[PDB]
Amino acid sequence: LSTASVLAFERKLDPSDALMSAGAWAQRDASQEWPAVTVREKSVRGTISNRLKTKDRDPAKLDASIQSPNLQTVDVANLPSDADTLKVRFTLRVLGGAGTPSACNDAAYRDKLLQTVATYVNEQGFAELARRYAHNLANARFLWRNRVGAEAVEVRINHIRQGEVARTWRFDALAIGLRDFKADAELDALAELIASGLSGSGHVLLEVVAFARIGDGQEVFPSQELILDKGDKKGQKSKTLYSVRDAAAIHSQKIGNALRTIDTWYPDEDGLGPIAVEPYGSVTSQGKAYRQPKQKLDFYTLLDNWVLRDEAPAVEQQHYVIANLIRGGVFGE
């Protein structure tokens, strides 16, 4: 009847921080003694290229301020002058036990949710969601700005069972698109492994390595940190990059957002591409929230109409509901 007041779901598909190293192409097989890329700090001189605030001031100050230079000091990460290949490496743990919540108040809602997830996994198992996750692992979507000028990307995936590699996949990330999910032979085996891990049987451990071919001495883009308080003028930095163990890296939540853009079922203009699975599915780069609560297609009204009133939606929205359960989150009323 009435829903719960505490309802939390833990996160499956847990990645690590993707670390960067530099090397040469055609030595991509012995790619373990490669040195890492390091962040440097350069001080630059430029102009005043921002809009003026012409209120409550004098114009002569602005005319002085535009005819004067502007000194800053930012961070930058490059490749060395004799290495054209960027290697991005991380791991992945698929846990399994998807529909079981980590917190639930009402026992009746818990039993009805368990029966709904059991009916879903009996009728339609994790065959579409794991296929889309394997597609997003296949094309190197986890290299965000390291993929716009890349000449060729190559993704190598290793399944680890006890202490050694049990199965090896290799994909060309440029032939596999970013906006259509086709069918293949090895991708279906990887999807079946991810599905067998998501169904509580195993906790699959994968190792993902990506090789991107940029060019000698060009720029690589690590993650940037959100710093709200840069102290005072004449000494501030205004750009800081992320690195672990003195090696430039990418945040784990960025990789997690990268392998999560599977939702193509949002109502208006679904041909623009997949977006990430979010309640009231929103993009920060767009400033727009698709799946508004006005048209009944968000997560909460769909879950309440599926569980409480048994008004089951279309299968393309049941996939979105179960993907939101796989992602995790905190909901309560």
Partner: protein
């Protein structure tokens, strides 16, 4: 009668501050402000506005800025075990907070006027001359407005929590568990840190600066406190959290407790 002129000047300073802040000279907006402020309709509005709670030991809004729950004003008992101790229960008597809607926060500024006791004016239950000295027209409005003023300080409410709060488990020695909902203690060691960093650092600091070779040394000192960390709760409007969070803007000023590096 006695202190009526003080609160009259208080409402007049509020009115002139509002007129200098808005400065609208169209359609008699200043007359529409003087219609409310110069009469005692402001006192009726200050009696109307409910939502303050006077809670110090429990403030839920640091855990999440929109987390509606129960807030408490109750100090724990002293523990029995030696060593550890918290919540400053020995001495240096405490200052209380105010949690509620920000739009009525100025009402607390009406109750904290330092004329014959600011905290005494905030809870004027003991006095009897001021209770009839507040108004001049009748007696029913006096008792009603006094009851509204002493009511919005201490109210109980209902025991509640939130999904965005914290709720843990604790193993018992026999079997079973407890649910252990913690809260945020509004303690002011911020003032101790400000005193030890900016009040008397100067004189003893220059005494240690330019009198090392000399025997002239003051009977005082200082403290450096390395590796502090600032944490902010309200983003740019800290008054939505509480009133003591407005006194200090963020700046939780967390103390370092980090493990040594081997080499």
């Amino acid at each position: 009668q006695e202190l009526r002129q003080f609160i009259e000047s208080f409402i007049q300073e509020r009115l002139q501050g509002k007129l200098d802040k808005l400065h609208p000279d169209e359609d008699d907006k200043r007359q529409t402000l003087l219609a409310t402020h110069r009469r005692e309709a402001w006192l009726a509005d200050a009696a109307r506005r409910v939502g303050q709670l006077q809670l110090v030991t429990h403030t839920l809004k640091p855990i999440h800025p929109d987390a509606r729950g129960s807030n408490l004003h109750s100090l724990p008992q002293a523990p029995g075990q030696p060593g550890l101790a918290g919540s400053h229960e020995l001495g240096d008597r405490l200052v209380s907070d105010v949690v509620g809607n920000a739009a009525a926060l100025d009402v607390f500024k009406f109750l904290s006027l330092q004329y014959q006791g600011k905290n005494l004016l905030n809870w004027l239950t003991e006095d009897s001359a001021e209770a009839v000295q507040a108004l001049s027209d009748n007696a029913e409005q006096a008792r009603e407005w006094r009851q509204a003023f002493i009511g919005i300080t201490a109210v109980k409410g209902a025991p509640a929590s939130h999904s965005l709060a914290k709720q843990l488990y604790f193993p018992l020695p026999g079997s079973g568990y407890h649910l252990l909902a913690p809260l945020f203690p509004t303690s002011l060691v911020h003032h101790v840190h400000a005193l030890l960093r900016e009040a008397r650092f100067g004189d003893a600091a220059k005494a240690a600066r330019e009198a090392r070779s000399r025997q002239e040394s003051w009977p005082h000192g200082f403290s450096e406190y390395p590796n502090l960390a600032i944490q902010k709760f309200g983003g740019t409007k800290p008054q939505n959290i509480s009133q003591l969070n407005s006194e200090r803007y963020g700046e939780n000023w967390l103390l370092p407790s980090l493990p040594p590096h081997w080499q």
